[PDB]
Point group: C2
Chain length 387, copies 2
Amino acid sequence: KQYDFTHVPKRQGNSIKWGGLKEKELPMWIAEMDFRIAPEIMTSMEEKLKVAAFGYESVPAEYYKAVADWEEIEHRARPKEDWCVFASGVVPAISAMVRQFTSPGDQILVQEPVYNMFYSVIEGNGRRVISSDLIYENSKYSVNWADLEEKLATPSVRMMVFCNPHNPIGYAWSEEEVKRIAELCAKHQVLLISDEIHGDLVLTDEDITPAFTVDWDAKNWVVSLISPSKTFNLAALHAACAIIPNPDLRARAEESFFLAGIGEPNLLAIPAAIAAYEEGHNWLRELKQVLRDNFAYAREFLAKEVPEVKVLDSNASYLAWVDISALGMNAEDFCKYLREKTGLIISAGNGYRGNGHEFVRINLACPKELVIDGMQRLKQGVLNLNN
Amino acid sequence: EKQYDFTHVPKRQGNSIKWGGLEKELPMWIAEMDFRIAPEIMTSMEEKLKVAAFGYESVPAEYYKAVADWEEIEHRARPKEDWCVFASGVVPAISAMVRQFTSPGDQILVQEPVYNMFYSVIEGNGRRVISSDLIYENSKYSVNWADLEEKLATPSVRMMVFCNPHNPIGYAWSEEEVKRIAELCAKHQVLLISDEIHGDLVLTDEDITPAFTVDWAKNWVVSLISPSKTFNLAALHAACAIIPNPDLRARAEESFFLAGIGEPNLLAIPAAIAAYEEGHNWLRELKQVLRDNFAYAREFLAKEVPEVKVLDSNASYLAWVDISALGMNAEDFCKYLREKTGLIISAGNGYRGNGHEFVRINLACPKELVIDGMQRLKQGVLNLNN
């Protein structure tokens, strides 16, 4: 390679992933990487620091142009720069738009099993989660279009929070699927909030259909949310972008961001995100490569040594969604037992709700050597359940 | 000799609010400095960048110990570390507590003229500003205690956002005033939100009285501090709420997390710790530079521009200047002044109160720029009388 995907960065003590760990514990749960970031991003941060003064920052149009250029090169989708609004984070943007575009007690539709923070921002703000569960009929998840529409048509259902690609299952919806969802939301005057934070991480050539691509009129009912944070290992950068074609909605969300305190970039957000989106193409190409190898190793080891589990077919994200149902153990119990016996820490599916009690989520955005370790620890833990 | 550099203006990138989008124009409006930051802080930032991976951060105990140590050494007031909660900014913290601790339609009290952003977070959140106006007589502002108490007594008045020290008039309240304001709030079951972001910048020995030091009324107060104004780190997005009431404190923190302002960014923790552990010497030199700038500016406006009156102040690097004798609304004056001289200062109108008669001037810049701006101000006033 041209980039380091071998050495795990040495964090300071206050890391969520690596902080507070017992000796030899291996964290493979929270969605951040154990890879150093792109040097082109690093250079922009070191460059910014040399200003040696960190007063108030505006969002320059270069930021919106970088977002537009990135979306077109990586996704063959180009937003109008005018549609774009800076937010310091995807989840806080959802939180603010929940408060601005729905009322206390309104229902907000999700597709379970879905990312836990969806529930935290809906319920934490006093809105009610309603799910049109994704059907787990094969080794696959699919949409009940009848059930989805009738829930969308419920008057108290005011918003749909859509994970595109879908986390934790790792599925980049098809162009027909995204467009059909956005048409159904428009038809029932439901706002479609499309969380596309995993959108740069499709591992197949099947690229994402960003919600803002839907044709006009329905385009007036969508928001796309992106960030460099998952793509480039920049969770603590606090840079993100809302893409809102409807300009009334856009002006209202921009004010909601300002009032939440998430509308103003910190000292590194602008130059670092611009560098990521202008210069991070080559580092991401190699990243997906390392991800595809770790998934290939992961799937083969588990097929040959832990056939009682099943790594689901996934086409996006660095998170493996593993069916542990045949182990007969609740995911959280299994994950606890795993850490206790082997020191391997992975994400229980329970918090994603849906059928997550039968699933674990494993973070493969780490050097192959840590995948080898983690896969060996999983098997050791499965074997002792039998002894 | 100064150990630090207060002579060279930082070379900013294009998206600077103060210096972006400007030939020869001189911005002295928005409250950020034109000095380099303390090298002890820069060292901490460059060390954190070597991690070269910026995943999720916790708030370490060393952050709160740094805040407590700083408050004890600079202000003779050590908060309990348990009372301390990280927030990504003072104004976002105010805004979150408006939403969490008041209802839509409740009134929130301020003392006009005061920071424009207070109105934005109150009004934009669907609460109603109520002001107990400061009384302007003798070129001094005074608190109308009777009006203050009657308004705090109003059932719909549920929160007071207090600026301590007060922006834009530059006044560090006395110990008596802070405690009285806290006791009046507590008496009426009103939350006192004490924005103490200018607290380290009292340019005299006169010190600030943090709201957290009020007698065990202490259950009704929140002190908000940050290194941002003190060390020229607005965009660092590091702040700290000091909340002695443990239940109020946990609710505020929950509100910060829900809003997206409870998690530190990649530099907030090490940089704030360095500022609060190793920034004492730099701050002491800064205050000598600021006193020198104010001495020159006050003398130069008193001797050369008798048409304006700089109000007496003891805190902040901002000067509050009565321009009423020019007979011109401050918004229009500031527009004309920019057109004729290139000097950009803050019109008083947005601070409400009697701000239509005032301008605000930021003197936290090298003395060469202070000289330039003061001379341009005279140029603009002379251009009016001619």
